[PDB]
Amino acid sequence: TGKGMKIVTSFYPIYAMVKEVSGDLNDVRMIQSSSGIHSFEPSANDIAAIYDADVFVYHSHTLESWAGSLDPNLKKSKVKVLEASEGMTLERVPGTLYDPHTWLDPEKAGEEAQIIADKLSEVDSEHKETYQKNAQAFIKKAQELTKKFQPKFEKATQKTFVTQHTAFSYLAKRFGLNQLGIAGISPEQEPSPRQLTEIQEFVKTYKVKTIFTESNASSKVAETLVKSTGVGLKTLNPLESDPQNDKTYLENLEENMSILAEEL
């Protein structure tokens, strides 16, 4: 063919992971309206752009809540709608609600790459070879990232970190670390400020030096935490936006894995 399969994609970890699985094969574009995956709701335009694509790929029913309820066979469409984490077992929001933030655990990015290739290679049978090997490398350089880093986080310099929202729960757990998010699983679940007072002392108790913000401006509520008791601000990417740059997906995961481990 002289085109490829037109493929729409919810947000970055998906963008990057379909693109890595496809290599040079398909027309992979991202819903790229822009805003923030947790609170984002597709315009009539994006909806029509989905129904217009050959393939649409999202992360999970627990994140992109519109997606279930996309109705191609009714709205006269022929999209393959693909939930890339389908089957993947998600941890419950602690103590109904589940943490979607898989992609940040190198192993789990790996498993999601696979699912992608599988579903892609049933939909576009010819290119099964290209998908399964692109994914295969991916999972391989992911298992290697886990290996490079397991010792880093072993040597500790103690455990705990605090991030702008609750995104690193899966990373942290794969590495013996424990995290605290200023916000809940989504950035719009902001503290209280009774919660703010607790997290304030958590910084003290567990003796934490850097609060990790994002660019993604909407945490003054973090800024104002150096700007209270304690000190120290550094930015840590949950990969919900794309940084663009050139870097691969795993290259960006690794880069923020640097930052976090270097902080010890």
Positions at the binding site: 38, 101, 165, 240
Contact status: 81 vs Na ion (CB under 5 A): yes
Q: Name which position in 95, 96, 129, 217 contacts Na ion (CB under 5 A).
A: 129
Structure tokens at 104: 């940040």
Residue 24: count other Cβ atoms within 10 Å of its Cβ.
7
Give the chain's count of helices (H) and strands (E).
8, 9
Q: Distance of alpha carbon 111 from its chain centroid, rounded?
A: 13
Q: Measured from the CB atom, is 18 or 81 closer to Na ion?
A: 81
Contact status: 167 vs Zn ion (CB under 5 A): yes
Only one of the segments 25-33, 51-59, 123-131, 160-168 lies at the binding site for Zn ion (rule: CB under 5 A); that segment is 160-168
167 binds, options Na ion, Zn ion, none, Cβ within 5 to 8 A by partner type:
Zn ion
**Rg of the chain over all Cα atoms, to the nearest angstrom:** 19
Only one of the segments 13-21, 88-96, 113-121, 130-138 lies at the binding site for Na ion (rule: CB under 5 A); that segment is 130-138
Residue found by looking up tokens 């789990």 in the block: 108
Only one of the segments 31-39, 126-134, 153-161, 218-226 lies at the binding site for Na ion (rule: CB under 5 A); that segment is 126-134
Contact 125, 154 (CB under 8 A): no
- List all residues 6 or more positions away from 111 whose beta carbon is below 8 Å from its beta carbon: 88, 139
Residue whose CB is nearest to Zn ion in the complex, by number = 167
Give the footprint of Zn ion on this chain (CB under 5 A): 167
Give the footprint of Na ion on this chain (CB under 5 A): 81, 127, 129-130
